[PDB]
Design an enzyme around this catalytic site. Structure first.
Site, short mmCIF file in Angstrom:
data_model
loop_
_atom_site.label_atom_id
_atom_site.label_comp_id
_atom_site.label_asym_id
_atom_site.label_seq_id
_atom_site.Cartn_x
_atom_site.Cartn_y
_atom_site.Cartn_z
N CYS A 1 -36.28 -32.72 -30.31
CA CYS A 1 -35.67 -32.03 -31.44
C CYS A 1 -36.42 -32.34 -32.73
CB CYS A 1 -34.20 -32.42 -31.58
SG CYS A 1 -33.21 -31.49 -30.42
N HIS B 1 -28.37 -33.40 -36.56
CA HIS B 1 -27.72 -34.23 -35.54
C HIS B 1 -28.45 -35.54 -35.26
CE1 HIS B 1 -30.39 -33.44 -32.07
NE2 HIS B 1 -30.42 -32.16 -32.43
N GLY C 1 -35.52 -36.03 -27.13
CA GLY C 1 -36.40 -36.50 -28.18
C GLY C 1 -37.28 -35.43 -28.80
C1 LIG Z 1 -33.14 -32.58 -29.19
N1 LIG Z 1 -33.70 -33.90 -29.02
C2 LIG Z 1 -32.30 -32.17 -27.96
C3 LIG Z 1 -33.12 -31.16 -27.04
C4 LIG Z 1 -32.42 -30.92 -25.60
C5 LIG Z 1 -32.50 -32.26 -24.69
C6 LIG Z 1 -32.97 -31.90 -23.46
N2 LIG Z 1 -33.72 -30.56 -23.67
C7 LIG Z 1 -33.01 -29.93 -24.92
O1 LIG Z 1 -33.94 -29.18 -25.77
N3 LIG Z 1 -31.12 -31.53 -28.41
C8 LIG Z 1 -29.75 -31.96 -27.96
O2 LIG Z 1 -29.60 -32.89 -27.20
C9 LIG Z 1 -28.54 -31.16 -28.51
C10 LIG Z 1 -27.75 -32.02 -29.47
C11 LIG Z 1 -26.61 -31.13 -30.16
C12 LIG Z 1 -25.74 -31.96 -31.07
C13 LIG Z 1 -27.22 -29.86 -30.86
N4 LIG Z 1 -27.63 -30.68 -27.45
C14 LIG Z 1 -28.13 -29.97 -26.25
O3 LIG Z 1 -29.29 -29.77 -26.13
C15 LIG Z 1 -27.10 -29.45 -25.20
C16 LIG Z 1 -25.84 -28.92 -25.69
C17 LIG Z 1 -24.90 -28.42 -24.80
C18 LIG Z 1 -25.17 -28.43 -23.41
C19 LIG Z 1 -24.11 -27.85 -22.43
C20 LIG Z 1 -22.73 -28.06 -22.65
C21 LIG Z 1 -21.78 -27.52 -21.74
C22 LIG Z 1 -22.19 -26.78 -20.65
O4 LIG Z 1 -21.20 -26.25 -19.75
C23 LIG Z 1 -21.56 -25.03 -19.04
C24 LIG Z 1 -21.70 -25.37 -17.55
C25 LIG Z 1 -23.56 -26.56 -20.43
C26 LIG Z 1 -24.52 -27.09 -21.33
C27 LIG Z 1 -26.45 -28.94 -22.92
C28 LIG Z 1 -27.38 -29.44 -23.80
#
Ligand SMILES: *C(N)[C@H](C[C@@H]1CCN[C@@H]1O)NC(=O)[C@H](CC(C)C)NC(=O)c1ccc(-c2ccc(OCC)cc2)cc1
Ligand SMILES: *C(N)[C@H](C[C@@H]1CCN[C@@H]1O)NC(=O)[C@H](CC(C)C)NC(=O)c1ccc(-c2ccc(OCC)cc2)cc1
Lengths: 305, 305
Positions: B145, B41, B143
């Site tokens: 990841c 990603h 950041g």
């Molecule tokens: C990597 N840099 C990063 C790490 C995250 C940021 C903050 N702390 C975490 O470890 N990863 C991402 O940003 C990642 C990117 C995707 C394309 C894999 N996404 C998430 O961490 C993330 C996905 C989904 C949610 C979420 C969606 C819907 C919700 O509804 C329920 C109420 C809840 C949560 C959150 C974060």
């Protein structure tokens, strides 16, 4: 976004760990520039340790009685001296992996990473606080002496601790890198009392702020208190008294969470009087006091080195 | 002699951390030989992340769209490919600091060290367990990841985890180094359920053995139990069922402490039914399940790397 007890990356310190052997005793030393630092009780036999005269014992030793190994390389010892409780061995080779470094004497309540070592080889890393009674609650077996505690500031390693002994209560005692013990301890196998320990109040408040930042907010109450009123409750529960210097240190965390420091004190007050009654905060059922305000800001802001 | 949550020395992994930038997104990559591994990603915009078609998004990218930095050095990207959820960037330079390494897929209940990183620079190290529901309880900000989890076996680094995302409950999810997620998760910004989690029973028993080794013995009782009788209590408290394979793994610890595994199960049974009622074990007021039997033996035997 999660809160963990986190140690500094240990790579810069790993490159400074050597093995020091004198007679039958082997322990860890710290190799910086052309000097190796280690606990002076490396020169003691098991019998010497009951009541050592270190000046007399050292006079029986010469440079060639000290074997220093860095991995498989053998360093040549060209001088030796005692500085308080540390031995300084001058070697003919400067450590090519010496980082930018400082020697610091830390204050009680401050935290640091420990690189636990045996036979000159790193075993593991963990975080701990210098207790108000100048002990640390570590994990140290025989041969671990000379393992060091440190903080990292960008590229500079600040060495603050070197391990010397275990106390009767199972906690650990050691020196700064000038060889001066933290606390009232001496490097002799005799019964030694640490004072009553107290809880590092400003650290618990920082951790409560960490909890609120990370979604735990159940412990927040509708009460406030005063510095003198809280300190009445601190004394009863063996907590360090809170000062305006402490309030000032908590300021940035107050500003980010929008929670006044004295309101957090009232929450902590009710925790101290009423307990946790089965709930958890940041995964712990105890009030945690080994995170400094700086530690919380660092972990929540993602500071790198 | 003390028991601490201890991470592996992180030096060998520090030398493999690089920064990967694609467009506006920057995260961490792992540089081994002439390949850099990072979450796919990295190619996503904030809008892409809601519903990414990774094959279509990657086709719009060429080698020169990926910027890889190791400190201040700029690596040249000469090839790219997607393997499951990881991107593999071929570079023109093999990492001179590559350690002996393996890629492993760990089992739930196993533990590993995490080197948390931002912009390619290590920030801290901590220990965690792969939960039975294939999440980890980490500390990860934006950041982070591409930060990795690993174990160390003497001189060999076994990489087992790379961080990808945070779940709604605040726990974290990621892949092995072949890019296959642990658990049912996908790399998309959508609500994702982790299963109910369970407690790693064999790990709690190992920690109880650690406690007895370190002087905590108040929880020992005069009762015993059977595997089927204990597992009745395990199911009620959401503990993993104990098998003879687990008993066998605990064998060495049984032999050292002279406490039969099923007697420890009866102690744990009474802890689960009657609580801690205010006491502590190895400094915790909770039953700890992120130490494997191997972890306990290692820390109590002082294994070095
Ligand atoms: C990597 N840099 C990063 C790490 C995250 C940021 C903050 N702390 C975490 O470890 N990863 C991402 O940003 C990642 C990117 C995707 C394309 C894999 N996404 C998430 O961490 C993330 C996905 C989904 C949610 C979420 C969606 C819907 C919700 O509804 C329920 C109420 C809840 C949560 C959150 C974060
Ligand atoms: C460094 N290799 C080593 C680290 C110890 C070994 C096991 N875990 C510890 O961290 N340090 C020593 O062995 C050190 C040598 C001295 C010369 C400084 N001594 C001790 O650790 C030690 C000293 C004293 C006691 C002790 C004496 C009397 C007691 O009576 C009260 C009941 C209790 C304890 C124990 C250990």
């Amino acid at each position: 976004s999660g809160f963990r007890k986190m140690a500094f990356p240990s790579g810069k310190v790993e490159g400074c760990m050597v093995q020091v052997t004198c007679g039958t005793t082997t322990l860890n030393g710290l190799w910086l520039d052309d000097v190796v630092y280690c606990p002076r009780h490396v020169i003691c036999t098991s019998e010497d340790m009951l009541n050592p005269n270190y000046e007399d014992l050292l006079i029986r030793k010469s440079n060639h009685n000290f074997l220093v190994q860095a991995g498989n390389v053998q360093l040549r010892v060209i001088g030796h001296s005692m500085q308080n409780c540390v031995l300084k061995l001058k070697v003919d080779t400067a450590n090519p992996k010496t980082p930018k470094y400082k020697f610091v004497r830390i204050q009680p309540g401050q935290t640091f990473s420990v690189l636990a070592c045996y036979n000159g080889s790193p075993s593991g890393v963990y975080q701990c606080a210098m207790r108000p009674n100048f002990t640390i609650k570590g994990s140290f077996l025989n041969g671990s002496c000379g393992s060091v505690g440190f903080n990292i500031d960008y590229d500079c390693v600040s060495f603050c601790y070197m391990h010397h002994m275990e106390l009767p209560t199972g906690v650990h005692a050691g020196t700064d890198l000038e060889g001066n013990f933290y606390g009232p301890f001496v490097d002799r196998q005799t019964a030694q009392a640490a004072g009553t320990d107290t809880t590092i109040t400003v650290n618990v408040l920082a951790w409560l702020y960490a909890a609120v930042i990370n979604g735990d907010r159940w412990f927040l109450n509708r009460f406030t208190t005063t510095l003198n009123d809280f300190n009445l409750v601190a004394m009863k529960y063996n907590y360090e008294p809170l000062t305006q210097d402490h309030v000032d240190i908590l300021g940035p965390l107050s500003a980010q969470t929008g929670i006044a420091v004295l309101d957090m004190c009232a929450s902590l007050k009710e925790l101290l009087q009423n307990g946790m009654n089965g709930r958890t905060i940041l995964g712990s059922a105890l009030l945690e006091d080994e995170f400094t305000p700086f530690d919380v800001v660092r972990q929540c802001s993602g500071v790198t080195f």
